[PDB]
């Protein structure tokens, strides 16, 4: 199975991410909350990045790839 190699913002696919949360809006908060987390760590919630980050990756993009790999929960209140 192959769709193709995605470019930039379209990676990772939204479909593979939606399997990790309930709705698209939940997914938004997920990456957002984690994005602030990573940035706080760069200028010391302080954890990660769990995945090997390519240089200059926007912490939002890092948080998305984290959710792709099931690396974080992910509890809804």
């Amino acid at each position: 199975s192959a769709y193709d190699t995605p470019l930039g913002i379209t990676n990772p696919p939204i479909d593979e991410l939606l399997s990790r949360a309930s709705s698209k809006y939940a997914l938004v908060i997920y990456a957002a909350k984690r994005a602030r987390q990573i940035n706080d760590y760069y200028n010391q919630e302080y954890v990660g990045p769990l995945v090997e980050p390519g240089l200059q990756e926007k912490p939002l993009s890092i948080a998305l790839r984290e959710i792709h790999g099931d690396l974080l929960e992910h509890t809804e209140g």
Partner: protein, 31 residues
Amino acid sequence: VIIGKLIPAGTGISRYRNIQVQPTEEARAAA
């Protein structure tokens, strides 16, 4: 919107904004 609050819809709903995000105990270890 008038007072500048989050609209009670989409990402403004309570169940979505109060989410807590932490790495799994398994994930933090692997680093």
